[PDB]
Ligand binder design. Structure first.
Ligand code: HEM
Ligand SMILES: CCCCCCCCCCCC
Ligand SMILES: [K+]
Ligand code: NA
Length: 391
């Protein structure tokens, strides 16, 4: 029960957490009020929490956080601040604006594929990781030559999304390092923001400074928090959509060959990967008031963990849920969330993967998995450090 949750955090289960997720879902919703916790795993319950007007994303409303104690980016804020801050960047991430990036993405993918040397290569280092990094750095106005340092700080803050406090009552062993990385990143971005008051940029950071300096809609601290969020999302997400999709195709009869032969399968491959092997495995909410999900009540202040990975494999929603099937009639997932905090990066992530995947398959139609992949320790933003492909 609580043993199953700790098995999820155990690194030994990272390569295949799905038996555990499925077992938890079969058992039903987990009400653990003595741990100030509730764990939802059905599609219905996760959907309901994401939409519930009393579900909060601000940690200040959390009993666990208030006890641990004894601005955050808008991912972790509620209205009105969430509404205002998301509103300020949503146009920048709209499909119409993101579509303009297709030539840059295509040139990057081609360059990266050109540089691949056989007979074996790590998809992570050679493609899945560097593509999204180049794009987000350009978008935000962060110099690509500073990437070595972003990468390490970014990796640490991605890891910080693991629900150690909720599941174990203690902070991560990485806590001190993560605070240091957070401070470094804020200071770093502050300096980039300050130079944009002197030299005109053509990037999102500059656009945000223009608004901040014109009125009361935005503070410098908020620009820092927003850009930090965007930079990290750009480093720590799409990489896993690409790599998880590659892995699922390599493991599933005919799938790599089918995409190599027909790039139009890319969209279905991507959405079925979001369902079957989600880059973001779980999200957290806090009950802003006593609330009901299905027949279960969650006390005000308790953490609600939503195991999206389990929800995507709910047999009441999808047939053969544990099969990777890009040809299935209905692909339904919550891999980009739902409602107020729905992923702002979804058009960009989709575009990045839509260009990358069919190009990869077409370039190496005879590709096979070489050995078994190695996983990072991360639970929430779960991904491979090594995915070896023999060409
Ligand atoms: C496949 C890649 C991605 C996945 C799977 C993913 C997943 C998610 C999920 C599940 C959420 C909702 C979290 C919640 O409800 O608490 C979210 C929110 C968010 N995502 Fe993504 N994301 C991806 C790529 C990106 C990219 C590339 C960016 C931009 C660089 C981005 C920017 C954001 C932002 C700003 C939010 C917060 C939205 C809000 O709070 O209003 N994402 N994402
Ligand atoms: C500051 C960390 C932001 C990285 C999150 C990227 C978007 C994915 C949402 C994950 C929510 C648990
Ligand atoms: K201001
Ligand atoms: Na908006």
């Amino acid at each position: 029960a609580q043993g199953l949750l700790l098995q999820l955090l155990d690194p030994a289960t990272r390569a295949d957490p799905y038996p555990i997720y499925d077992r938890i879902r079969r058992g039903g919703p987990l009400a653990l009020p003595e741990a100030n916790l509730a764990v939802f795993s059905s599609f219905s319950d996760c959907d309901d929490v994401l939409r519930h007007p009393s579900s909060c994303s601000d940690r200040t409303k959390s009993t666990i956080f208030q006890r641990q104690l004894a601005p955050a980016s808008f991912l972790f804020l509620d209205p009105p601040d969430h509404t205002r801050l998301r509103g300020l960047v949503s146009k920048a991430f709209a499909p119409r604006v993101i579509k303009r990036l297709e030539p840059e993405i295509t040139a990057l993918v081609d360059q990266l594929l050109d540089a691949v040397d056989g007979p074996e290569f790590n998809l992570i280092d050679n493609l899945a990781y560097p593509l999204p990094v180049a794009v987000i750095c350009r978008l935000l106005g962060v110099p690509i030559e500073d990437e070595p340092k972003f990468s390490r700080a970014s990796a640490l803050l991605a890891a910080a999304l693991d629900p150690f406090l909720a599941l174990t009552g203690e902070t991560s062993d990485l806590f001190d390092e993560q605070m240091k990385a957070g401070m470094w990143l804020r200071d770093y971005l502050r300096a980039l923001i300050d130079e944009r008051r002197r030299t005109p940029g053509e990037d999102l950071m500059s656009g945000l400074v223009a608004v901040e300096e014109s009125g009361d809609q935005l503070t410098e601290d908020e620009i820092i928090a927003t850009c930090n969020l965007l930079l990290i999302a750009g480093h720590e997400t799409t990489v896993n959509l690409i790599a998880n999709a590659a892995l699922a195709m390599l493991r599933t009869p005919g799938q790599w060959a089918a995409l190599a032969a027909d790039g139009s399968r890319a969209s279905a491959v991507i959405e079925e990967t979001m369902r079957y092997d989600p880059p973001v495995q779980l999200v957290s909410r806090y009950a802003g008031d006593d609330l009901t999900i299905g027949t279960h009540t969650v006390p005000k202040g308790d953490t609600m963990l939503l195991l999206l990975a389990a929800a995507h494999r709910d047999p009441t929603i999808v047939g053969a849920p544990d099969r990777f099937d890009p040809d299935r009639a209905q692909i339904r997932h919550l891999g980009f969330g739902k409602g107020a905090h729905f992923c702002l990066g979804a058009p960009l992530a989709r575009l990045e993967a839509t260009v990358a995947l069919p190009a990869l398959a077409a370039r190496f139609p005879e590709a096979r998995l070489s050995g078994e992949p190695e996983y990072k320790r991360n639970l929430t933003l779960r991904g491979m450090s090594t995915l070896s492909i023999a060409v």
